[PDB]
């Protein structure tokens, strides 16, 4: 089966809003959730990192900002771990530069299952959401599925591969979304 | 002709807040709302949760962490300069006896007459899960009309989540 990142309603909206407010700059933040079995990453929530960085490096991550935010979120019942990071590339589309690879490396050190999410919030206004999620591949480094090998090779080519993305919503959120509409 | 424009994310965040804190039957949750109030329509674009405690058996005792509003707003200012502190929300379902008093304390953080959003989190009714209030002498709550305005990025988000 295919590993899949499940993104909750507020996570998607906060991402979209933050990416849009940062145009023309690449903006960035952290994603909170949980890892489950091997085919499942839940993104429950997200928060923005300040644009202190010139661009989107490991340096753009504000350790004291992150800790202060995690601490205050905890006091209001948000207690999930960091499951990766997201960043926007405005108009550039969904993929990773070499700098993003490096940023992602440093996230994988902390946690082997860490995910990188790219949003293009400009292209998203065409009436469809342009997001994807990515991981590095270098661990794995006669029936088969042809499109899975085609991908596993382009993967080795650029040093990373994509994950499926889905959206979760509670029945309550569903009801509420139907009124915000 | 006072009107409120509410972004969907704000309501979704009230909801998520109320659910994650396991908010018991009769209890309520409380937060801060952020947006723009320099014009005749009030733009509510964001929110964040507060630690908050009341006494179910005594409605005149309640605790709001002032440090926390200060420290959080400070951090919101670092990501978006334009989103100011304009009011507060709670989960209701109706106006509570201590609300005027709570409202008075939020005045010290806002630059308007603070807006009170009562968010219906129980969804047991027909349309907009939100009623907007402002305090006024005429001290008593005035119902204001409100509506949903979504900056395009959010709007196709909301429609992508429903398809």
């Amino acid at each position: 089966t295919k590993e899949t990142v499940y993104i909750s309603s507020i996570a998607l909206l906060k991402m979209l809003k933050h990416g849009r407010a940062g145009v023309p700059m690449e903006v960035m933040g952290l994603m909170l959730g949980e890892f489950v079995d091997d085919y499942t990453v839940n993104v429950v929530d997200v928060f923005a990192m300040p644009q202190s960085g010139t661009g989107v490096s490991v340096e753009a991550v504000d350790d004291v900002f992150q800790a202060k935010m995690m601490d205050m979120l905890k006091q209001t019942g948000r207690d999930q771990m960091v499951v990766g990071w997201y960043h926007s590339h405005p108009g550039f589309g969904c993929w990773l530069s070499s700098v993003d690879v490096n940023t992602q490396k440093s996230f994988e050190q902390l946690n082997s299952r860490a995910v990188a999410v790219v949003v293009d919030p400009i292209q998203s206004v065409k009436g469809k959401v342009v997001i994807d999620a990515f991981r590095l591949i270098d661990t794995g480094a006669g029936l088969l599925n042809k499109a899975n090998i085609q991908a596993l090779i382009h993967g080795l080519n650029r040093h990373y591969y994509s994950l499926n993305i889905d959206y979760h919503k509670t029945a309550k959120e569903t009801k509420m979304l139907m009124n915000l509409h | 002709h006072e009107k409120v424009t509410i972004a969907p994310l704000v309501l979704l965040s009230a909801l998520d807040h109320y659910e994650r804190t396991q908010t018991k039957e009769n209890k309520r949750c409380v937060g801060v709302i952020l947006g723009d109030a320099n014009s005749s329509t009030i733009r509510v674009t964001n929110s964040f949760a507060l630690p908050f405690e009341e006494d179910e058996k005594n409605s005149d005792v309640w605790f709001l962490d002032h440090n926390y509003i200060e420290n959080m707003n400070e951090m919101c200012k670092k990501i978006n300069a334009k989103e100011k502190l304009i009011g507060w929300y709670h989960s209701g379902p109706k106006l509570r006896a201590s609300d005027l008093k709570i409202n008075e304390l939020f005045k010290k953080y806002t630059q308007n007459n603070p807006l009170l959003l009562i968010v219906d989190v129980k969804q047991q009714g027909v349309g907009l899960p939100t009623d907007a209030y402002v305090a006024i002498e005429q001290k008593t709550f005035l119902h204001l009309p409100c509506t949903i305005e979504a900056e395009e990025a959010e709007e196709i988000g909301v429609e992508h989540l429903l398809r």
Epitope: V36, N42, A171 | Q22
Partner: nanobody, 121 residues
């Protein structure tokens, strides 16, 4: 109420129980069933989760190697088989359903009323 738990009761330490939950499927559609448990004066705690289609399963650490969750999806039933029971497994057990495959109680959509398991000390 759509979910109805069953099984459960008093068992000695070391003993075995099989909990079941039947879903009537009349208000909530679900792709995921979970068991949760709540001991008095503790938080609700995640036990195990399963996908209706596929049967993928996930377990809480304190429960691995001894509990098994499974589902008879033509019969709309979920099972929690509990072996090697310890007194700290005493709690009310709730099945829940929704679309979130994971651990967080507030991400589930509907709840049974719970069934008491008492493991003798």
């Amino acid at each position: 109420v759509q979910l109805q738990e069953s099984g459960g009761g008093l068992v000695p330490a070391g003993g075995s129980l099989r909990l079941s939950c039947v879903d009537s499927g009349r208000t909530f559609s679900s792709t995921v069933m979970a068991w949760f448990r709540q001991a008095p004066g503790k938080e609700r705690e995640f036990v195990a989760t399963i996908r209706w289609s596929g049967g993928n399963t996930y377990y809480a650490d304190s429960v691995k190697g001894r509990f098994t969750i499974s589902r008879d999806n033509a019969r709309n039933t979920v099972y929690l088989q509990m072996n090697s029971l310890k007194p700290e497994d005493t709690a009310v057990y709730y099945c829940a359903g929704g679309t979130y495959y994971g651990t967080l109680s507030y991400k589930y959509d509907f709840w049974g009323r719970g069934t008491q398991v008492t493991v003798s000390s």
